[PDB]
Ligand binder design. Structure first.
Ligand SMILES: Nc1ncnc2c1ncn2[C@@H]1O[C@H](CO)[C@@H](O)[C@H]1O
Ligand SMILES: Nc1ncnc2c1ncn2[C@@H]1O[C@H](CO)[C@@H](O)[C@H]1O
Ligand SMILES: Nc1ncnc2c1ncn2[C@@H]1O[C@H](CO)[C@@H](O)[C@H]1O
Lengths: 263, 263, 263
């Protein structure tokens, strides 16, 4: 199957024409949308969503990742194969930073084989359709990785500050605010569990000049409605939520904001 | 096929990872999205959308319904088989109230068979992925209903006031406001047709302290642009619309608001 | 495959029930969404999106186009076969104006064969589900075009002013503003290239009483961030964009607005 992720939105016909290209190459391709609502040009956001979503895709899944503000420039077009046997077709702009780091990379190929393109003359601003999508289609059909082009020994990396436990607390950043307003961080719940806390315990959440108390819970329903809670989200990351409410609003925080969890 | 309905939104990667789980279990599963834009935690809204959409799905369709604010709590996870031979995989929070009432229930099973789960250790807040979705996948693949777990003799019901015809009028509630602003009620068009009215007749619509006149019509185009009309929507429910306009705005009404249709 | 385009939105269960009808008729149907976010009743917008998207669909693709404010009225329901061998199932309201003009029409059939319908008694306001969708399904399954109904010798056309090159400049209109804010016109990039301009050249963009200078470029990245550029979009149309910005905001323009490109 193909894991599809972009910042194109579902309003435009872009996603659709990309899917038609894939289907023309391989009518049996299974295209699963991770999301096409990554904020415009937000590769950082895509890098996290990509990793988190990939955890539930099987090995040998071909990911088509296109948040590519540098489309048509000298930036490289690449295919990365990670050590957990997954493949990623994307621009070399750092969007594959998280999967590379978390999974480790087995090999990287630069997209050079023009026989794999949709059109002999690729448009300058829509490689998603003319290059990436058709390459993902071929790979998902069984094209050997080496037929993509030459190997690359390096790739662009996005700078990321690794969250740590210092002085009974863990400092991190808001990685993703979902539609419910839940606030997921880049702080692994295992790391948090190093402050020697446990479910039913109460901790402190510091955002900006604000400080809140919050129960460590398993389910939203574990606290009264409207109350705050700290818990492991579906991907193993520490998330702050308001039971039947919007934590992003209560905390008044946005993606990228620094967050501190104190015992 | 699988009818998929949630309040997760399409912006998050949630819908996607759920679909990947289904596809991993059964690559041939046909997943049709009813909608993933039910307002957060709005089971009432989902219960109506579910019923209305189910009318066009064939018998033996497996519905995956996940608007589950009580995820991870003692609330039961169930599979309901209705008398029209459709199946519903959902939380026992009343979201299956309308199909149960309208179709009648043949049997209910509590989800207990852990061999049907996606993960041996289900996350606390995303049973949609770890329990419901994989159970729907197995059922759609032909798993006998009894393999799901033990039978249940009752289920949670949402309180709903049945609309009636009293004194040349029918009182009801706004069930769904669609993207055009059309205002669909919970009033069956057949019931309305008891006030001895007919197409081309004019009736009165009362909302709040407001009263409007509206023609009973078949098509929006049956009245001048901007005019109000009362008609049967695609599911047989009385709906109020503005031809080439937004009735929710003109009436200034929202879902749940009481509505009165007077001869 | 079936190219699906409507103004129904993805929030409602409408798109879903239409897809279930198609799948019931032909479980092997490949439904590719072009977009369901065309503004309500905006056939003009749909006519352009349709054409632009069709360029990447293969010949023999069956397009299901339903932006039908006149649903249930005397307006005809038709199937148009163009000279590039594509088929379009739609209301005869002018939504097929652009493909007809650009591709030329080989034949038009009025939908008359009721054996092709979803329901013996079609709803008055949702022919998308009861007539169009099932007809598209049958055609995609191989139903000969003549079985649809009698031939029609004419069809509704939307009035459109053809952009031209007069006095070193080209006047046109904004056809589509995408999610990035890019401003695509109805001006073919080939026509623009008649003003004897070339990449790296600078031209003038006139909107309203405003005038801007903009570089003619290939990729957004070809200019500094925040700068304006004129380039050919993925469909060959002249588009104005802001590198890593929103041109619709900078120009303060909307679809339908007249635009002038001066040497
Ligand atoms: N105005 C723009 N400036 C820079 N990049 C853009 C712009 N519009 C679209 N893109 C990029 O084009 C890519 C698709 O080819 C998208 O991933 C998007 O990030
Ligand atoms: N902050 C929250 N409070 C209560 N329930 C939530 C919250 N966020 C998500 N959910 C529920 O989690 C379910 C998916 O596991 C969704 O159906 C949603 O209703
Ligand atoms: N209030 C309305 N007035 C006119 N047309 C409408 C209205 N609501 C929905 N439609 C049309 O119904 C069609 C689907 O049957 C849509 O394409 C839409 O354009």
């Amino acid at each position: 199957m193909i894991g599809f992720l972009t910042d194109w939105g579902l309003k435009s016909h872009y996603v659709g024409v990309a899917k038609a290209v894939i289907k023309r190459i391989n009518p049996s391709a299974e295209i699963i949308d991770i999301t096409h609502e990554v904020e415009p040009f937000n590769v950082r956001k895509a890098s996290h969503v990509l990793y988190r979503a990939s955890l539930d895709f099987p090995p040998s899944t071909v990911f088509l990742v296109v948040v590519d503000y540098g489309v048509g420039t000298s930036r490289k077009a690449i295919v990365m194969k990670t050590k957990n046997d997954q493949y990623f077709v994307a621009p070399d702009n750092g969007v594959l930073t998280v999967v590379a780091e978390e999974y480790g990379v087995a090999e990287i190929r630069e997209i050079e084989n023009r026989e794999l393109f949709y059109k002999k003359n690729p448009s300058f601003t829509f490689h998603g359709r003319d290059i990436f999508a058709p390459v993902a289609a071929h790979l998902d059909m069984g094209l050997p990785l080496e037929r993509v082009g030459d190997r690359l020994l390096s790739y662009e990396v996005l700078k990321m500050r690794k969250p740590v436990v210092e002085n009974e607390k863990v400092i991190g950043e808001v990685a993703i605010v979902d539609t419910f307003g839940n606030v997921s961080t880049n702080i692994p719940f295992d790391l948090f569990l190093k402050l020697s806390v446990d479910f039913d315990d109460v901790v402190r959440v510091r955002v900006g000049r604000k400080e809140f108390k919050a129960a460590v819970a398993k389910a939203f329903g574990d606290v009264d409605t409207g109350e705050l809670l700290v818990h492991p989200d579906s991907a193993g990351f520490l998330e702050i939520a308001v039971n039947l409410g919007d934590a992003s609003q209560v905390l008044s925080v946005k993606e990228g904001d620094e967050i501190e969890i104190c015992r």
